[PDB]
From a paper:
Residues 297–391 (using the numbering of the longest human brain tau isoform) constitute the proteolytically stable core of paired helical filaments (PHFs) from the brains of individuals with Alzheimer’s disease. Here we use time-resolved cryogenic electron microscopy to study the in vitro assembly of recombinant truncated tau (amino acid residues 297–391) into paired helical filaments of Alzheimer’s disease or into filaments of chronic traumatic encephalopathy. At later time points, the first intermediate amyloid disappears and we observe many different intermediate amyloid filaments, with structures that depend on the reaction conditions. At the end of both assembly reactions, most intermediate amyloids disappear and filaments with the same ordered cores as those from human brains remain.
Again, most filaments comprised two protofilaments that packed against each other in various ways. As time progressed, filaments with two J-shaped protofilaments disappeared and filaments with two C-shaped protofilaments appeared. Among J-shaped and C-shaped protofilaments, the opposing β-strands comprising residues 305–320 and 365–380 hardly changed their conformation, confining all differences to the β-helix turn and its surrounding residues. The difference between the later J-shaped protofilament and the earliest C-shaped protofilaments coincided with a rearrangement of the 364PGGG367 motif on the opposite side of the protofilament. The formation of a tighter packing of residues near the 332PGGG335 motif in the C-shaped protofilaments compared to the J-shaped protofilaments may drive this conformational change. Finally, the change from earlier C-shaped protofilaments to the final, more closed, C-shaped protofilaments of PHFs involves a second inwards rotation of the β-helix turn, which again concurs with a rearrangement of the 332PGGG335 motif.
Numbering used by the authors:
A (entry chain C), B (entry chain A), C (entry chain E), J (entry chain H), K (entry chain G), L (entry chain I): 304 to 379
D (entry chain D), E (entry chain B), F (entry chain F), G (entry chain K), H (entry chain J), I (entry chain L): 306 to 378
């Protein structure tokens, strides 16, 4: 029959960090020697060809203190 | 039949970082040597060819204290 | 049939970073030596080709404390 | 005949020398005391009381590179 | 005839010397005391009381890279 | 006839030498006391009271790399 | 008849009481340190840091003298 | 008849109490340190760090001199 | 007939009581250190760190002298 | 015969004191009871009669560093 | 016969006191009781009679660093 | 016969007192009780008579650094 829903999440969260110093972080990758020989390079569908490339990320957050909080409610 | 929905999500949160110093963060990738030989290069659909590239991200936020919150409610 | 919806999400939050100093953040990639050879190059749809390219991002926000809050409500 | 003289050099030569990358989180903080009726210093006396003296000499650290790409027919 | 002279050098040559990468988290913090009627120092005396000295010398640390690449028919 | 002279060098030549990578978590913290009527130093005296004096000399550490890629028909 | 009533009193009555005649040559001279992120005092807390607190209560020390020089014929 | 009533009193009556005549030559001189994230004091706490306190009480030290000197023929 | 009533009193009545005549040459001079995340005091705590707290209570020490020099013929 | 006298005293004297404090010096003498009975006091020559007297000196020099230096020379 | 007298007494002297403080110097003598009875007091020559006197000197010099020097020379 | 007298006494002297403070110097004598009795008192030459007398001296010089130098010379 009749419906009552009471939905009262209550959060008191301290998500913290207290870092004194981040030092001389060095990021220095090096590619060497790469060679490809062929009659064809022949790439059909969704091919990733990455020959001698470098992908480099230097992420240095002074705090990275991520919070995710997802809610839902449903009725029919 | 009646419906009552009372939806009072409460948050109190501290999402912090008391970072004292970020130092001499150095990012210096080096590409080396790369050499590709063929009669054809032939790329048809969604091909990513990266020969000898560098992709370089240097992300240094004094705080990256990311909060995501998400809500939904649905009725029929 | 009667419907009462009361929708009062509360947040009080401190999403902060008391960062003392950002140092000598250096970003210096170097592309090296690249060689590509063919009788033909033939690229069709959604092809990417990144021969010897540099992409560089240098992102240094004094705070990057991204908050997202998303809400929805729905009825039929 | 052909001669195809194509040497490749991608070398790196480096001298990281002195005081480098050291962290030094909070040196000091201790009490130091001297009490006297006389202090008397008179010839090439070096005196330090509670100092945090960082000092560095690098008369070295030098780099040398020589290459001689000679070719002759 | 052909001669294809293509040496490749990808060397790293490094000197890494003196004081490097040391953390030194919270040196000091200890009480030091000296008490007298006289302190009296008179020829080439080195005196240190409580000091957090870090003196460093590097007369060395050299690098020498030498190459010759002669070809002749 | 052909001569394909293609030496490849990937060498790492290194001198890591001195004081390296040490952690040094909380050096010190201990009491020191000296009491007198006189202290008296008069020719080449070295005197230390509660100091945490770190010191490093590197007159060595040199690198030499030599190559003679000679070719002759 | 004669009565020669001549009592002599040269008495001294004294209360030397409290802190008296103490010399106190150079109290103090020592380092004192407190370090924290929080200090929190909230009900009848008495706190002293390096103080040289001399204090003295003398609700006593009182003197009483009674004499009754009665004579009767 | 004669009565020669001449009592003599040369008494000294003394209370000498609390802290008296003490020399206290150079109290202190020693390093004291306290280190924390929190100090937290909440009901009738007495805290002392390095203090050269000298608190003194004298509720006592009283003197009472009573005399009667009756004569009768 | 005669009565020569001449009592002589030379008495010394004394209460020397408390802390008296002590020399106390150089009390202290020693290191003290405390390290924590928390100190937490919550009901009638007495806490002392390196203090040289001298203290003295004298509720006693009283003097009473009573005399009844009665004469009768 | 002929006379030469050379009289060269040479004095470099430090007579010192370095007193930090002189305390609560008390001087309190007390005479008691004294009685003399006689037919005569009869004093003829250089008599000192000192009956029940007090002679009191309270000398407290902050330094009392006395020097005496007496010289003479003579010829006939 | 000739006479030569050369009389060069030299003094250099420091006759000092670095006194920090002179305290509560108290001088309080008390005469008691004194009683002299006779048919005569009869004092003839150089008699000193002191009955019940007090002589009281309170000398408190911040320095009493007395120097006496004395010289003589004599010839006939 | 020839006489040469050369008379050069030299002094350089510091006769000092760096007195920091003179305190509560108290001088309080008290004469008590004295009784003298005779049929006669008879005093002749150079008699002194000091019955119940107080002599008091209170001498507190900030410095009393008395120097005497006395010289003489004589010939016949």
């Amino acid at each position: 029959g009749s419906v009552q829903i009471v939905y009262k999440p209550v959060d008191l969260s301290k998500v913290t960090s207290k870092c004194g110093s981040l030092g001389n972080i060095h990021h220095k990758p090096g590619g060497g020697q790469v060679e490809v020989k062929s009659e064809k390079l022949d790439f059909k569908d969704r091919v990733q060809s990455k020959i001698g490339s470098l992908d480099n990320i230097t992420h240095v957050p002074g705090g990275g203190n991520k919070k995710i909080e997802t809610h839902k409610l449903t009725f029919r």
